[PDB]
Amino acid sequence: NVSGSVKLWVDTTQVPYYKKIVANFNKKYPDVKVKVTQSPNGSANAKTDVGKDPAKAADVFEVANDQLGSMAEAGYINPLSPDATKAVKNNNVAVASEGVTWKGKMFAYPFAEQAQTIYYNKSKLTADDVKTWDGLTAKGVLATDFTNAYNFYPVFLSAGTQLYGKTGETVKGTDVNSAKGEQAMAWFAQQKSNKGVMQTSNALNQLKSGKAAAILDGPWNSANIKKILGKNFAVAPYPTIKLDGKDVQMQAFLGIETFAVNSHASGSNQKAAATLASFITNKESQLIVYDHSGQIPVDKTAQKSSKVASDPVAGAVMTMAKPGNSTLMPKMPQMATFWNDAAPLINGAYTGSIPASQYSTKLDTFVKNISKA
Ligand SMILES: OC[C@H]1O[C@H](O[C@H]2[C@H](O)[C@@H](O)[C@@H](O[C@H]3[C@H](O)[C@@H](O)[C@@H](O[C@H]4[C@H](O)[C@@H](O)[C@@H](O)O[C@@H]4CO)O[C@@H]3CO)O[C@@H]2CO)[C@H](O)[C@@H](O)[C@@H]1O
Ligand SMILES: *O[C@H]1[C@H](O)[C@@H](O)[C@@H](O)O[C@@H]1CO
Ligand SMILES: [Cl-]
Ligand SMILES: [Cl-]
Ligand SMILES: [Cl-]
């Protein structure tokens, strides 16, 4: 019998439907007491929410796949059992398994596939307009944030550089300190004078007011944006961009959203936590998340269901997940330093705080900073 008491951390607006999922869980596991709350700072900050005091953190918590290597090496999460590993591998798409695997072992329970797309108001821009960055921004305003490296670091990947090597597993493998990296820096800088590019900390509000015709965003906002745009809703994969005078696809990161089990839980509570993590990432639960938020399941069967298959956001995400259109986020322990250092690199190029005469130096220093043992 599974019994115990578990705390579950989810992101703010997810609480209502995780309570529904937990009610489903409790039909099968009536002797597990679950408390569902928001986390202190959300799934994009699980590393530091848990690391501040692992023994006081939730037993099961939402976390993006890039954070897993750091958390595994710190001992905050343990490997999944053989049976749990088999279920993850068999039920979900291959990239979901890759996303949670570190040194040959799975460390979390994947549930959603995340790639950003263009969301746009089709009364302001056409499907043809959004195929290229320069064409889109010549015709309407794209609102975005150059201080968030999750948005723009993948331009370096479009430029032909590697992040932690060919596999994302090589500490010294980032090669952005190159002429190709400089092409990306120049692209950022070009956007400052692009009248169709608006820097904002809240792109969603600009879409809502009609001051932006398009934004780059992820599927955690799919249902939100469908509500904002109504009959004018449209979505597309990322456009091409011009780097060194050549059109190339602009990449996004591919992320896998997961739940992980805190290694501090023990005894019955540990078993209950693992059971909960497995249940809330099962097919039925993934489809409940989809119904409420529009996030894209990783379950193989759920992706093929008619509601998911007919959703234009799902189609655009599965295009973005193809080779060449995105790169799976690495999960190296160095990733937290990478994110911290990448944002000023990119934003400095955009604002001109880093002039072109400094691109090579700044890229060299960046690679040194993010490549330490
Ligand atoms: O140094 C800057 C920050 O670096 C680190 O943040 C990283 C994360 O570790 C990455 O996972 C990623 O974050 C993505 C995230 O993967 C993605 O899911 C999405 O997050 C949504 C979330 O799904 C949704 O439920 C709700 O919470 O809104 C979120 C968006 O606001 O988008 C994230 C990016 O915006 O990239 C960031 C870097 O931006 C580190 O964790 C931080 O502590 C640090 O500040
Ligand atoms: O996904 C975001 C939510 O929108 C915030 O409310 C909070 O939960 O942080 C996460 C990201 O970590
Ligand atoms: Cl697959
Ligand atoms: Cl361009
Ligand atoms: Cl415990």
Side-chain angles (χ1 to χ4, degrees):
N1 148 88
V2 185
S3 71
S5 292
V6 53
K7 181 159 39 154
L8 175 62
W9 276 355
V10 304
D11 296 344
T12 303
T13 69
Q14 301 178 151
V15 173
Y17 50 93
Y18 280 95
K19 289 175 79 63
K20 297 178 188 187
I21 289 165
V22 165
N24 292 341
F25 170 78
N26 278 140
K27 297 172 195 176
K28 188 169 182 214
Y29 300 102
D31 301 329
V32 178
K33 293 176 174 178
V34 183
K35 284 217 167 43
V36 182
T37 72
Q38 72 192 248
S39 55
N41 296 284
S43 59
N45 296 295
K47 41 184 151 177
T48 48
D49 282 353
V50 175
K52 272 188 199 96
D53 192 340
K56 291 184 191 171
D59 304 288
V60 180
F61 56 88
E62 197 173 342
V63 53
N65 77 284
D66 64 298
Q67 296 171 43
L68 292 174
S70 176
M71 296 188 81
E73 291 298 317
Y76 300 153
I77 55 179
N78 291 324
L80 269 55
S81 71
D83 287 346
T85 298
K86 172 185 185 191
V88 171
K89 275 194 201 153
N90 291 350
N91 297 346
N92 303 291
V93 296
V95 68
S97 291
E98 187 185 356
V100 302
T101 297
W102 174 247
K103 297 183 175 174
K105 297 181 177 188
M106 297 191 175
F107 284 90
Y109 295 80
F111 71 93
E113 186 167 341
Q114 298 178 342
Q116 295 200 161
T117 54
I118 314 172
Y119 293 86
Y120 67 101
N121 183 331
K122 72 186 191 193
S123 74
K124 296 179 180 290
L125 292 164
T126 73
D128 196 79
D129 292 336
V130 301
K131 290 183 185 308
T132 78
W133 181 272
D134 286 339
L136 188 169
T137 59
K139 301 259 197 120
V141 174
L142 191 150
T144 194
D145 185 3
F146 286 87
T147 75
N148 188 339
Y150 179 87
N151 284 331
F152 288 106
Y153 193 90
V155 174
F156 288 111
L157 305 173
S158 296
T161 74
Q162 299 194 141
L163 181 57
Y164 296 114
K166 304 167 182 181
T167 175
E169 299 182 294
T170 306
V171 171
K172 302 294 193 188
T174 306
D175 65 359
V176 77
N177 57 328
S178 64
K180 289 174 181 307
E182 296 182 35
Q183 295 172 15
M185 293 290 276
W187 184 92
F188 304 134
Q190 288 165 353
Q191 306 315 316
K192 193 64 168 74
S193 62
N194 186 335
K195 307 179 193 191
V197 174
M198 177 199 299
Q199 166 65 39
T200 179
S201 287
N202 197 319
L204 212 53
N205 273 347
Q206 307 306 323
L207 194 65
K208 217 171 293 171
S209 67
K211 306 316 167 34
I215 65 175
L216 308 181
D217 210 347
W220 54 87
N221 277 331
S222 171
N224 292 327
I225 295 164
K226 290 176 185 176
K227 180 173 178 178
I228 288 165
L229 289 177
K231 295 169 290 283
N232 287 327
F233 177 85
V235 65
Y238 273 14
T240 60
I241 52 172
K242 286 185 200 299
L243 292 178
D244 193 35
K246 295 178 189 175
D247 299 305
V248 299
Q249 217 66 38
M250 183 181 178
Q251 290 198 27
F253 283 116
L254 182 63
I256 304 298
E257 198 66 49
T258 85
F259 284 93
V261 174
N262 191 324
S263 66
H264 273 71
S266 66
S268 296
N269 288 346
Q270 178 186 11
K271 187 174 202 310
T275 305
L276 180 67
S278 176
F279 187 95
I280 73 182
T281 65
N282 77 9
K283 177 173 59 167
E284 179 183 68
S285 296
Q286 289 184 30
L287 286 165
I288 291 165
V289 171
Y290 170 78
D291 289 336
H292 288 82
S293 67
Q295 289 220 55
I296 305 307
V298 293
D299 180 275
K300 295 174 185 172
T301 300
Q303 288 197 346
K304 295 184 200 219
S305 69
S306 76
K307 66 181 168 197
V308 176
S310 69
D311 186 335
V313 177
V317 170
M318 300 175 195
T319 288
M320 288 299 292
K322 291 278 290 299
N325 297 339
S326 65
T327 295
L328 180 64
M329 291 195 288
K331 65 166 70 65
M332 295 296 285
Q334 295 79 3
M335 285 297 283
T337 300
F338 162 80
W339 294 117
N340 183 77
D341 292 351
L345 178 73
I346 295 163
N347 187 234
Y350 171 68
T351 67
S353 178
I354 300 173
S357 59
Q358 292 182 25
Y359 293 165
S360 179
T361 306
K362 297 289 167 174
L363 291 163
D364 278 341
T365 296
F366 175 72
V367 167
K368 289 177 185 168
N369 283 340
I370 72 165
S371 305
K372 297 174 180 171

